[PDB]
Design an enzyme around this catalytic site. Sequence first.
Site, PDB file in Angstrom:
ATOM      1  N   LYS A 146       0.854  -1.188   0.000  1.00 13.24           N
ATOM      2  CA  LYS A 146       0.000   0.000   0.000  1.00 13.24           C
ATOM      3  C   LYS A 146       0.891   1.240   0.000  1.00 13.24           C
ATOM      4  O   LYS A 146       2.054   1.153   0.372  1.00 13.24           O
ATOM      5  CB  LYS A 146      -0.878   0.004   1.260  1.00 13.24           C
ATOM      6  CG  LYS A 146      -2.263   0.604   1.048  1.00 13.24           C
ATOM      7  CD  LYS A 146      -3.324  -0.489   1.032  1.00 13.24           C
ATOM      8  CE  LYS A 146      -4.712   0.051   1.217  1.00 13.24           C
ATOM      9  NZ  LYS A 146      -5.328  -0.444   2.468  1.00 13.24           N
ATOM     10  N   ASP A 160      12.727  -3.439 -15.335  1.00 10.08           N
ATOM     11  CA  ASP A 160      11.285  -3.181 -15.467  1.00 10.08           C
ATOM     12  C   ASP A 160      11.002  -1.738 -15.927  1.00 10.08           C
ATOM     13  O   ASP A 160      10.146  -1.051 -15.364  1.00 10.08           O
ATOM     14  CB  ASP A 160      10.521  -3.544 -14.179  1.00 10.08           C
ATOM     15  CG  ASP A 160       8.999  -3.731 -14.304  1.00 10.08           C
ATOM     16  OD1 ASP A 160       8.501  -3.903 -15.449  1.00 10.08           O
ATOM     17  OD2 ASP A 160       8.314  -3.756 -13.249  1.00 10.08           O
TER      18      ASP A 160
END
Lengths: 316, 323
Positions: A25, A130
């Site tokens: 989160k 990435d």
Amino acid sequence: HMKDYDELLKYYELHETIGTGGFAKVKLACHILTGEMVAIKIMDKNSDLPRIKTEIEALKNLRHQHICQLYHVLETANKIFMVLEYCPGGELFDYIISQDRLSEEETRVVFRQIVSAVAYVHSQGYAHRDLKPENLLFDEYHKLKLIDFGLCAKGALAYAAPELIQGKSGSEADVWSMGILLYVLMCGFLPFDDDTAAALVAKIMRGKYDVPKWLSPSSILLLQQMLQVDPKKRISMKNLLNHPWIMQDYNYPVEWQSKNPFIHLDDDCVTELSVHHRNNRQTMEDLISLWQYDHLTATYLLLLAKKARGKPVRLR
Amino acid sequence: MKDYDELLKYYELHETIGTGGFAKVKLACHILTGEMVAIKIMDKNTLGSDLPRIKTEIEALKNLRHQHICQLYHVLETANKIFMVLEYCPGGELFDYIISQDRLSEEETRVVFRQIVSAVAYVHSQGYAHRDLKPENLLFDEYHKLKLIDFGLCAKPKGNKDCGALAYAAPELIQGGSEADVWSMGILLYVLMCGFLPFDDDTAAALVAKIMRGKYDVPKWLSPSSILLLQQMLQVDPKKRISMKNLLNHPWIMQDYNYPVEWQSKNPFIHLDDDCVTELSVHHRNNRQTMEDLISLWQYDHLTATYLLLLAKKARGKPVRLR
Ligand SMILES: COc1cc(O)cc(Nc2ccc(C(=O)Nc3ccc4c(c3)C[NH2+]CC4)cc2)c1
Ligand SMILES: COc1cc(O)cc(Nc2ccc(C(=O)Nc3ccc4c(c3)C[NH2+]CC4)cc2)c1
């Protein structure tokens, strides 16, 4: 109370979530002493735990104006917290899809920031692994910040280099993804795209792609060099930094070298900390150079950013 | 653009709110109705061992339709993308509310807790157990109403076989029913009124021991009515824990309201609102008979999307119109 949030909440005032993701989160917060806004990656530690631990280690060693900064690491009973640089501007991905396509000149402003960041990563002996427009964020001054070093080594299929798919693992793959990024920015569509993953892989391996009519011969040439199937025939970082396309309205190569120091310290920032901890000077400087990524690394680096935006060197 | 081609016919995509793992939540706007939604974007080739947590949640949500459960409107699947179009909840977590203030009054907690009870009694009536009740999993809509989210750890207790936060976990769930959900509601009840968990420790091994022993602090400010509901819900033996039927009309729940919790759904699967079917019939340009037959399918496509948002728009006091 709440025993997970006791240490954290001595230093930070916790704001709106704007986070969700099973284990991870993100919560907005405010650093109490400096007044400065931060983002906190709260983890539910319990799984995928020493890939949080590799990211932290990489970020402790990477310091750059186009890499989003780590300030503080805190660990409790069932939490890992990562206090990070405030990036309210959104993803680069959010810009591409909402509009149609950038001009060559618009793409160059943006791409030179991507090159600066990635050339610094590689100089430190890392590869990001990435690179995609979801992983580039804008700060409050509309400057790009490279995020999420969760796959980094010392990703998305459409961005993946042929050799990475076809079984060989390192920083030649990052140059490929930068070439995919370059194409999407100027075209508004991916150079390899399909309804099935098996047909996407085949297109990447073959390496044939559309050359739109609007693309300049300078754009066509940089793309061909970066989107080489053989990673040995792909353009090197050294030749990228000073490529004719890269310097085509800027009369100078990409400044990839960090303006954020590890080994030189701001004296106004050391004096304004010597007032709080009631140390001398040599005591405060020696303590800071430990770079433990505790409350002192947080306060110092958020003091350094406070003077940068004009406001005074002041703790509350 | 091929992952977002189908989605972007129906939705205007806005700010990103989640990113966490395989899943990013994005704000969006449904083009025809104008109604705001939230979109859960699952990366299909990242997911892996935590991909069963997605298909089971969808199947549960397709069968759960309630005023205190965050509504699913649309499911879209591309080359590597599962999308879930969900109800707009801008009010934040119940977690965010708790940490911001001291500790809510008995009267404040009752307003909130009766919304949790309504939501969870409906889940259990459908033969499911949520299995991850905690204040992070309860959101406020734009009208300050709680909605139950994230059915990823979903159950079917007496169906076919396929955990959550430790502090909320029932003793029997640690050692290996919907009796566990009643316990977690009791932990929620305690935190709301006290501002701290009834069982809390620095190490997980010492937390487990405290849950199993089941002893907890009874603060001086807690009323004897609050003390009584808490010991009924926080029974270590799941056989001695209060039933859902006795919770719904408990003397604590009914204080100041003088009527029990209305847990039954006001959101129907069968009766197809009139004005919505007529509004859709004029847009699609077909009769009220096969517009109704097409709506009746609950495929969770663009037609379920438009219909359920039309039903939402009407309830809001707004014109029943598409553009
Ligand atoms: C190295 O940087 C990393 C590493 C990592 O694992 C994750 C992140 N993620 C971040 C995500 C978001 C933000 C952020 O600051 N977003 C933000 C801040 C303010 C507002 C928004 C987003 C959107 N609404 C307006 C206000 C910062 C880091 C980085
Ligand atoms: C069943 O409902 C589910 C299932 C699931 O797996 C995940 C969710 N998650 C949601 C998360 C957030 C929202 C949401 O609408 N949040 C929201 C919307 C607008 C704003 C905010 C949050 C806060 N910033 C200002 C505006 C909705 C569902 C649900």
